[PDB]
Amino acid sequence: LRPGRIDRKIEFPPPSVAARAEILRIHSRKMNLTRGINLRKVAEKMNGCSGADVKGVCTEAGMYALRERRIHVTQEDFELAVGKVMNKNQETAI
Amino acid sequence: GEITFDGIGGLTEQIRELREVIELPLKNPEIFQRVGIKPPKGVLLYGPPGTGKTLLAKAVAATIGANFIFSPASGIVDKYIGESARIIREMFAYAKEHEPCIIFMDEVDAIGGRRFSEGTSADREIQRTLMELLTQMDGFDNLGQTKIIMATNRPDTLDPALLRPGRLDRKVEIPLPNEAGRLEIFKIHTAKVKKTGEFDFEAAVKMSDGFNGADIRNCATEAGFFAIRDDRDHINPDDLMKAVRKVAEVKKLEGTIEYQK
Amino acid sequence: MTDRYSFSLTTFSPSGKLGQIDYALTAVKQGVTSLGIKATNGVVIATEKKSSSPLAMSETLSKVSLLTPDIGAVYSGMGPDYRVLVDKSRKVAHTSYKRIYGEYPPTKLLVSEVAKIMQEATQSG
Amino acid sequence: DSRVKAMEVDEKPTETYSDVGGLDKQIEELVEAIVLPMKRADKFKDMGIRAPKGALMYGPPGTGKTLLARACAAQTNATFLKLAAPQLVQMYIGEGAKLVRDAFALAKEKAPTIIFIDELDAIGTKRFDSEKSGDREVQRTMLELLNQLDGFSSDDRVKVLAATNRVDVLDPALLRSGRLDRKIEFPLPSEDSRAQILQIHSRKMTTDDDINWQELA
Amino acid sequence: RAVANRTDATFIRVIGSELVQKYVGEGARMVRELFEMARTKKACIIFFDEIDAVGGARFDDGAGGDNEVQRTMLELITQLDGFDPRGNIKVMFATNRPNTLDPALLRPGRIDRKVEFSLPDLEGRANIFRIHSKSMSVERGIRWELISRLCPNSTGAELRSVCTEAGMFAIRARRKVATEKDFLKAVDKVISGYKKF
Amino acid sequence: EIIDDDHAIVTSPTMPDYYVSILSFVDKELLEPGCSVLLHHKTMSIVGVLQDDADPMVSVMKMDKSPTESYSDIGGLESQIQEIKESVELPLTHPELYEEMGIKPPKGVILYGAPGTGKTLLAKAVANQTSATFLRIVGSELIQKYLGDGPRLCRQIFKVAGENAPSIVFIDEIDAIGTKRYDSNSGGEREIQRTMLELLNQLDGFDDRGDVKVIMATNKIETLDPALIRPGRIDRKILFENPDLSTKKKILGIHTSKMNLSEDVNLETLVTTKDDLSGADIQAMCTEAGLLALRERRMQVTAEDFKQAKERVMKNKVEENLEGLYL
Amino acid sequence: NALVDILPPDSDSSISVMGENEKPDVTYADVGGLDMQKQEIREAVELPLVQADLYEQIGIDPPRGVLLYGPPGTGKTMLVKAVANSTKAAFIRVNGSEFVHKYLGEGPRMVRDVFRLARENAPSIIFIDEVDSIATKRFDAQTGSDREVQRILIELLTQMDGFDQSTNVKVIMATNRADTLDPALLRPGRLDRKIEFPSLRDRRERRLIFGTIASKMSLAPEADLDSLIIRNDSLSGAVIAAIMQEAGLRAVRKNRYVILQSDLEEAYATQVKTDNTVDKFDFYK
Amino acid sequence: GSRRYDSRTTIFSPEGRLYQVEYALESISHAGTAIGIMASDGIVLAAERKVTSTLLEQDTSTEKLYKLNDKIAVAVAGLTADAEILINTARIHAQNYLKTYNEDIPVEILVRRLSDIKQGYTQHGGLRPFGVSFIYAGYDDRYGYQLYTSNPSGNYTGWKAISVGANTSAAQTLLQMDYKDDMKVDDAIELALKTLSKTTDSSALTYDRLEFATIRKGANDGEVYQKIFKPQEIKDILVKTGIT
Amino acid sequence: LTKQIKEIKEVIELPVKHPELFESLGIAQPKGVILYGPPGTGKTLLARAVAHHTDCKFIRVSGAELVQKYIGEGSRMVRELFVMAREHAPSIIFMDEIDSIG
Ligand SMILES: Nc1ncnc2c1ncn2[C@@H]1O[C@H](COP(=O)(O)OP(=O)(O)NP(=O)(O)O)[C@@H](O)[C@H]1O
Ligand SMILES: Nc1ncnc2c1ncn2[C@@H]1O[C@H](COP(=O)(O)OP(=O)(O)NP(=O)(O)O)[C@@H](O)[C@H]1O
Ligand SMILES: Nc1ncnc2c1ncn2[C@@H]1O[C@H](COP(=O)(O)OP(=O)(O)NP(=O)(O)O)[C@@H](O)[C@H]1O
Ligand SMILES: Nc1ncnc2c1ncn2[C@@H]1O[C@H](COP(=O)(O)OP(=O)(O)NP(=O)(O)O)[C@@H](O)[C@H]1O
Ligand SMILES: Nc1ncnc2c1ncn2[C@@H]1O[C@H](COP(=O)(O)OP(=O)(O)O)[C@@H](O)[C@H]1O
Ligand SMILES: [Mg+2]
Ligand SMILES: [Mg+2]
Ligand SMILES: [Mg+2]
Ligand SMILES: [Mg+2]
Ligand SMILES: [Mg+2]
Structure with missing residues (x-):
C-alpha cells in the first residue's frame, strides 16, 4: 500500500442497472426465453450489488418451471423468483 | 475408593432420582424398549461447593460396579489447538469397550461458556470442544450402555445449550x-x-x-x-x-454457596 | 452533596450515536407488550396487565394515567421512570399552558414538550 | 527435568522456634495444628476423624512465615519442599497447569512431607463475569489446586501449608473454613516483640550497653 | 577497574553478553572453569558482567520457553554456597536491573552489597565532559559547564559522542583547533535526534 | 574449530559431529575455520578445500567493483549527501586530519527516515567515490528457519570485510529482521535472537575494525529491538527529509526527458503549477503521463499530455486522503 | 523403491469419523413433524441427483448450496442425514474438529482433499457440521495459534466459490448462530438457498410429532389422544420429547407400560421456570 | 465514585481535532441528504426524509424543514432531539433582534451566534456538543440571498452550493458539473429532485419521502415569499421530470 | 461491468505481447495489478477470461505455501516462487491471498 509499488490499483464499481441487464440476458438464453419479456421487469425492480444476485433470480425462475414440466418461463415464474430472492437479501443485511 | 451405599444418605429422594436414569437402563434396556421411548439419559448435577457432589458421582459408580472415568475438563484443555478434540473423542470411544461405564465430566464449566472466541485461539477451542461433545451425545449416533453425567458449579459460565430440553430426563438441584x-x-x-x-x-x-x-x-x-x-x-x-x-x-x-440453573 | 461530576457521562460512541440512548432503548423492548390503533372516531390503546401475585390487588396496578381530561397515555419500559415523568408533564402542561392560553394543550403541543424533557435528562451529567 | 529437582528436598537444619522473635500467639497455634497431631497420630486414626490437613497463614510480609514452617518440618522429620506459585505459572497455558498436578504425585513418594506453597496472590480472585476472564489461566489453576486438596485422595497425611499476603486478594471458593484448616492472621509488632526482634539481630554483631534496645522499640 | 588498581587486587574481565558459550549449559562449564581458577588467585577480582545473558534468569515463564540459561545459573548458586570465606576474593556481578536477576540469587549471603548507579548531577557530568574534551585540541578558555548546562541529564557515552562530532565539524572547515562553537552544534544534533524516541 | 594436533571438529549433512583427523593436503594454516571443506566419505578426513562457502549468499554479498551509481548524478539533497561523505569517506581517504585534531575518526552512519527519498541510492553514490570495496547484502538472507546457520553467515561478513579494508559494509533491510517473530506461541525468540547477537559481537570484534565503516538503511531503529552498540561507533545519524521545492526541480528534469516532446513546457513553470510534492510523486506523475498516452492511443507524447497528467495525478492523491475536517 | 501399482485417489481419504457416515435409523421422526422442511431439503438436495434428466431439459445450472440456521433443537443435522442415508449417494461427514490442527499448514491439505474427493466419487454429498467455530467476526494473530484458524477459513472460502457448477450438491453447512459468519463473504450464489427453521409452530405441525410418540405405546384410555394436543400451545419438538421421556419413566414404577395421560400432564406443567416475572416486573413492566 | 471516574469531553486534543466532534460527522451522514442550491433570485432547499416506514404518518409530520420566519428556513440533518432545542433558540433570537431594532436580523448575525453556542459546549461547557448540521437558508435586502451551513464544531462557512447528510460527495459532484452560476431558481427546482433520486438507492424517490421549500424575491411588489411545499404539490412536479 | 472489461485488456494483454509498444507510447512496465471490489463481482471470472486471449500459463497459486510441505519448509517456497515462475514462463501468477490471516 505504498503507492506505485503495487504499480496499478483497480476498483470494480457495484453494477449499474444497465450492467445488470446484460448478465440477466445471457443466462436466460441457457434456460428458456422469458415469455412476454420480463427481463426488464427485474432490472426495473432492483439493482443487484453483485452478479450473484442476478444468478439467484435465474436459478429460481427455472425452478418453478421445472416442477411444472412446462419449459415456458412465464411472468408468474419471474415474479415469484424475484420476491423470494429479495426477502432473503434483506433478512441478512438488516 | 468405594462409597458405601448406606453411607450416602441425607437427601433420599434426590439420590433415588440418579438411579432411575442410570441404574435402570443398564440392568434392563428391555423395559425401555417395551415402552418404546429412547432410554433415559443425561443427568445434570448442580449445587454448592462441599455438598458431596463428587461423593455422589462416586457413590453411583461403586454401587453398580460399572467402570469409572473421573475426568476434570480442566485436564483436557492445552495450549495448542485441537488436542482437546482428540482427548474427548478417544475417551468416549474408550468407555465403549468398558461398557457399562459412566464418564464423570467434573467441572464441565471449564469448557462451558458462550460467546468469547475473539481473544487467544484457546477461547475458540473452548467452544469447539463443547460443540463436538454435544454432537457425540446426540446428532451422530445415540448413547448406549455408556452414559455421561455432567456436573457444574460456577454460574458465570453457563450454556442454554446444555440446559435445553432433549437428552436429559432430570435436571437435578442439590440444595442444603x-x-x-x-x-x-x-x-x-x-x-x-x-x-x-x-x-x-x-x-x-x-x-x-x-x-x-x-x-x-x-x-x-x-x-x-x-x-x-x-x-x-x-x-x-x-x-x-x-x-x-x-x-x-x-x-x-x-x-x-453457589447455585446454577 | 452534589456528585463531583462536572461533565456529561453520555458520550458519543466512537462509531457515532450515543451509548446511553442505545442502552436506554433495550428496556422498552424487554418490557411487556402494548399496542394502539389510531382510528377516525377514536383511538384504542391496549396492554397486558398480568397479576404480580394473586394476593396482590390487581386493580390498583395501573398503566393508564391522565395528562389532561382529554388526553391519556400508556407506556412500556421502566415503571418507576414513567410515574415521575407523568408528574413533571402535568406541571409542564397545565400551569404554563393556562398562563399562555388557558385551555387544555392540543395533542401535537403536549407531545413536543415531553420530547425536550427526555433530551435534557440525557444531556445533563 | 531440572525444574523438578529444584522444588524437591532442600531441608536445611532447624533454627528452633526460640529464635523467632516475640509473637507468641502465632507459635501456639502452629504447634497445635500440626505438631501434636503428628505425634498423637494414633488417637486421630482410632477415632477415624481426619487429622488436620493444613495451616493457612496470612499477614504482613516479614513476619517469619518461612522460618516458622521450616522449623516445623524438621521437628516432625518431614521434608521441606519449597514451592512458589509464580514459577509454576507460565505463558504456556497447558504446561503451567500440568506442573501443579505433577508436584503432588512427587509428594506422595516423599511422605511424610510438608508442602509449602507461596504467594497465591498469583492465583488472585475469581469474580469474573465478563468476556475477558483472564483468558482461563487464573480460573484454570484455582480449580486445579482444589483437586489435590480433595480429601478422598490422600491429603490428610502429608499436609499443605500456605502463605499469601491478604485473603481479600484470594478467591472465595478455596477459602472455605475447614478446607485449609485454621486461618491464622499475623498481628503486627506491638513494642514488645520489636525489642526482641532487634535483640536477636544484634547478637551476631558485638554487644555493648551503649545500645539501648528499649529506646529503639 | 579503578578500585582494582588502588586496592592492589588484580582484575579478570568476563562478559557473558559477548559470549555465545551457553548451549544447554556449555556456559555452566564455562562459569565453573573461570570462577574456580580465580578463587585460587589471592588478591583478585572477578567481574562477570551482563549476567543478564549467560547465567540469566529462566525464561520458562515467558513465550519462548528457553532454559539453556537456567543451567549456567544452577551451577552459579552451588559455587557461592551463600556466604563462603575466600580470603579477599571479590565476586562482582553486573546487571542492567537487579530485578531481572533470579530470586534465589537475590536472597542474602550471596550478595552482601547492592548499589544503584545513576546518571550524575550537573557537576559530575561537567567532569566526565571535561576529561574527553581535554584530550582533543580545542580553543582554550572553554566553559565545560556551559556545554553541560544545555545537555539534560545524560549517559557518559553521549558525552564522548558530543566531543567526536565537534571534532569532526571543525575538520570539515579545516580548523585543526575545535572552537567552542562546534560543541554547541554537536549537542543540538545528538540531543534533538535521540531524545524524541 | 581446528585443534593443533592434526585434528578438527566438523559437522557434515548428518546430525552428529566428528572428531576427525586431517590427513595431508591442505595445511592447517591454509585452512580458515568457518569454511566449507572436502571430506572423504568412507573415513571423514579433510582431503582438501576448493569449496570456500559455496553458497548463494556469498554470491550476493561479494561485489569487488565499485557501484553503478557515480556521484551527484542524483539531483538535490546535495547537503544531505555531503554529510554522509564527512563521516564515511573522509577518514578512509585521509585519517591525517583526524589524527591532528586528537579525536578518533567517526565510524558508521545510520540512514533512517522515510520511503521515496532514494536512501538506498545515496549509499551507493558515496561508496562509488571512495571506490571502497563495497560489500552489499539483504538482511532477509541472514535469518532463516534452520538452526545455527544464521550466526555462521553473520560472522563471515565481518571476516571478509576486515581483510579487504578499507571497506564499507552496507546491510540493506536490517529492518526486515525487526521484531518479526515467526509464531507467537513460541520460537522466534531462539534462532532470530542468536543471529543479531553475532553481528554485534564482531562489530567491535576481537580484531579492531574501525577501518570498516557500516551503513545501515532502515525505517527506524525502533522497529528493531534497540541494541546498536557503541553510539560513537555508529556516530552521526541521518534523518532524511523529503524533497522540497528546489530538490524536485532537478529530479523532474530527468523524468520529462524520457517523455517525448515535454520539453515544450518550460522546466520552471511545470514546478510552479503543481502542488508541492515529493520526488516520489514525480515518479507517480511521470508514469501517469504515459498511462494517459496509452488510453488515448496518442501516437507521440505531446505537450498536451504532460499538462493533463498533472491534474489527474494531483486529483489521485486528494481522493485517497480522508476528510476528517479541520475544525 | 519403484512404482509397481497405483492407488485410487479415493485411497488414503482425509481424516474422518470412525463410525459410519451412514445413519442406522429409518424409522424417522424426521418425517413426523418438521415435514414441510423435510420436503424442502429434498427439493434442493435429492431432486438434482436423482433426476439429472429434468435439469438438462430446462437448461438450469444445478441448484446452489444450502445453509441451515435456526435455533438448535430443531434436528437440523438429522433431517438432512436421513435423506443422505436413504438416497444412497455418497455421503462425507466431517467436522471442523477433523480439520483443526496444531501444526503449520496441516489444516488446508485436508481441505483440498474434501473437494476433490467429492468430485471423484460423484454424485456426492458434502456436509460440514461444525463451521461456526471456524468463522470469526474479526481476524487476529495475538497468539500464533489464531493464524492457523485463519488459514483453514480462507482456503475454505476460495474453494467454496470455485465448487460452483459441479454435479455434486454444493457444501451444506449448519450453524446454530450466524453472528459468527460475515455476511458479505458468505452470501447467496454459493448458497442461494438459505433455510429458516421456525419455532412458533402450529396446531397441525405439532400434531405430526404427537403421532410418532403415540405409536410407540398405546396411550391409556384415561382420557383421549387429543388431550396432549391442547396443552402445547406454541412449543417446539424438543420440549415435546423431554415431556414424553419423563412421563414414561414414572409409568414403569406403577407397573403399567401405558403412559398415563396424567403423567404427561404433570411433566408438561413443569419446566415453567425460565427467569420468572418478579425480576422483570420490578423494572421492565 | 465520582472523583475517580471521568468522562471529560473538555480535553484539548493532541491532533488539534476534538475526537467527539469527529464522530458527530459520521452520525450526520447516516441521516438523509439535504441540499442547498443558491441562485441569484432564491435559495432552493430540499431534503429527503430518512424514514420509509409505511405505518408511520410521514405526510403530516415535517421533521427536517422547519420555517423559522418569513425569510429564513432551516433544513436539518443530524440528531432530531438535539435539533429541537436549537430550533426554539433560533426562533426566539430572530424575534428579539426584530423587536429591538425594527429590522429583520441580517443572516450573518443569527448564524454566528448559534454556531458560538455549539462551540461553547466543548470550550468549557462540559457538555457533549450537538451533533447537528443546519443549512440556514436566509435573505436580507442588503446582501441578497446568503447561504451558510453549520458544523458540530461551531464553524460556519458560506457557499454557493452545499450538501450535508448522506452522499455529500455524490450530490456535490453532480451539482458542480450540471449547475452553472447563472441558472435561475426555475432550473434549480428541476435540478435538485433529479440529483437526489440518482444518489439514493431508491428506484424512484417518492413525493412522500421528500420535503421541498424555496425562498424567493420573485414574489411581486418587492416582497419575500417562502412556501413549504405540501406533499401532493411535490408529486405533480415529480411526474413532469419523469422520476415517476 | 463494461468499463472494467475494456480497461483490463490494456493493463494486461499488451505488456506481454508487445513490451516495446506498451513502453513507447507509455513508459516502462507496471509492477503488477491489484484487483479488488464486492465479492461476487466475478473479479475471478475476469482474470481467467483475459488469460485465455493472452495465451499464457495461468497458474493459480492460492494462499500460503506453508500448506506445501513436500520437500523442505514451505516458508521459503513463497520466496522461491520467483525462480520457478521464470523457468516456467510464459506465466500469469495469480497470487490470490486476501491477507486476513490476522
Ligand atoms: N449425603 C451425605 N452423606 C454423608 N456425607 C456427606 C453427604 N453429603 C455430603 N457429605 C460430606 O461432605 C464432605 C465434603 O464434601 P466434598 O467432597 O468436599 O464436596 P464437593 O461438593 O464435591 N466439592 P469441591 O470439589 O471441593 O467444590 C464429605 O466428605 C462428606 O462427609
Ligand atoms: N535526492 C534523491 N536521490 C534519489 N532519488 C530521489 C532523490 N529525491 C527524490 N528521489 C525520488 O525517489 C525515487 C526512488 O526512491 P525509492 O527507491 O522508491 O526509495 P527508498 O527511500 O530507498 N525506499 P524503500 O522503497 O523503503 O526501499 C527516485 O526515482 C526519485 O523519483
Ligand atoms: N424432525 C424434527 N422436528 C423437531 N425437532 C426435532 C426433529 N428431529 C429431532 N428433533 C429434536 O431436536 C433435539 C436435538 O436434535 P439435534 O440433532 O441436536 O439438533 P440441532 O437443531 O442440530 N442443534 P445442536 O445440538 O446445537 O447441534 C432432539 O432431542 C429432538 O427432540
Ligand atoms: N457477473 C456475474 N454474473 C453471474 N454470476 C456471477 C457474476 N459474478 C459472480 N457470479 C457468481 O457468484 C459466485 C461468487 O463470486 P466469485 O466467483 O467468488 O467472485 P469474486 O468477486 O472474484 N470474489 P472474492 O475473491 O471472494 O472477493 C460465482 O461463483 C458465480 O456463480
Ligand atoms: N519474626 C522474626 N524474627 C526475626 N527475624 C525476622 C522475623 N520476621 C522476619 N525476619 C527477618 O526478615 C526476613 C524476611 O522474612 P521472611 O521469613 O522471608 O518473610 P514472609 O514469608 O513473611 O514474606 C527473614 O529472613 C528474617 O531475616
Ligand atoms: Mg467436587
Ligand atoms: Mg516466604
Ligand atoms: Mg530503499
Ligand atoms: Mg447439530
Ligand atoms: Mg475472486
Missing part, C-alpha cells in the same frame, strides 16, 4: 441437606468416633441449622482435635457442643 438429612449425616459421623456416649447432637443441630455437608464433617474434626489436646480418648459431649458455636458464625460470614 434437610433438618434430619443433616442428622443422618451426623449419625454416621458419631459411630466412628470414640465416645463416652454423647447425646448432645439434638442441640448441636439447632445451631448448625442450614449447614452444608462440609461443615457437618468440620465440627466433628475441630471438636475431636479439642478432645485429643485435652488428653482424652473420648469426645465428651461438652467438646462437640463448643465446636458448633465457633463454626456457625464463620460459616455464614464466608459462605460462597
